[PDB]
Design a protein around this ligand. Structure first.
Ligand SMILES: [Zn+2]
Length: 44
């Protein structure tokens, strides 16, 4: 006996290992990662 699907925090971040209760909260977070261009003073 159950009303219906009881999904909870189905989304997560593998990059770091976080968990969000919404696809948005995640997509917004994952951002903190991306944005790392190669062009830099420490090429090697
Ligand atoms: Zn992350």
């Amino acid at each position: 006996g159950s009303s219906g699907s009881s999904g909870e925090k189905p989304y997560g971040c593998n990059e770091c290992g976080k968990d969000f209760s919404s696809k948005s909260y995640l997509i917004v977070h994952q951002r903190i990662h991306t944005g790392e261009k190669l062009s830099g003073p420490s090429s090697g």
